[PDB]
Amino acid sequence: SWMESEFRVYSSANNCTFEYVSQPFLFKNLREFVFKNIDG
Amino acid sequence: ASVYAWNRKRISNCVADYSVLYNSASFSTFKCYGVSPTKLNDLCFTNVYA
Ligand SMILES: *[C@@H]1O[C@H](CO)[C@@H](O)[C@H](O)[C@H]1NC(C)=O
Numbered sequence: 001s002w003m004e005s006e007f008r009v010y011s012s013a014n015n016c017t018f019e020y021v022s023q024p025f026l027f028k029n030l031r032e033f034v035f036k037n038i039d040g
Numbered sequence: 041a042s043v044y045a046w047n048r049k050r051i052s053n054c055v056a057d058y059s060v061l062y063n064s065a066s067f068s069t070f071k072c073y074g075v076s077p078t079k080l081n082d083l084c085f086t087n088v089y090a
Contacts, residue, residue, distance in 0.1 A: 018053070019053075
């Protein structure tokens with residue numbers, strides 16, 4: 001089996017304001033994304 | 041919780057069907073300030089705390 005740990009990304013997290021879970025966002029395959037942040 | 045050390049819950053990212061609590065017979069009192077309890081189902085807030 002395999003194990004994954006987010007503790008190598010951050011040591012801790014507090015005061016969480018938002019959470020969302022869905023399906024994965026991600027010859028060879030080319031993946032393109034656009035990230036915008038408008039009006040919150 | 042005890043009154044000197046009251047607890048808080050944060051409510052977000054949900055649909056607040058306030059009519060469920062307003063029309064409940066399990067309460068002895070229900071009073072609102074700054075808002076009417078019969079209009080709550082038509083309102084949106086940035087945060088709700090209980
Ligand atoms: C959590 O974050 C919100 C938004 O920045 C802030 O208003 C609130 O005071 C923070 N809570 C704590 C305990 O820091």
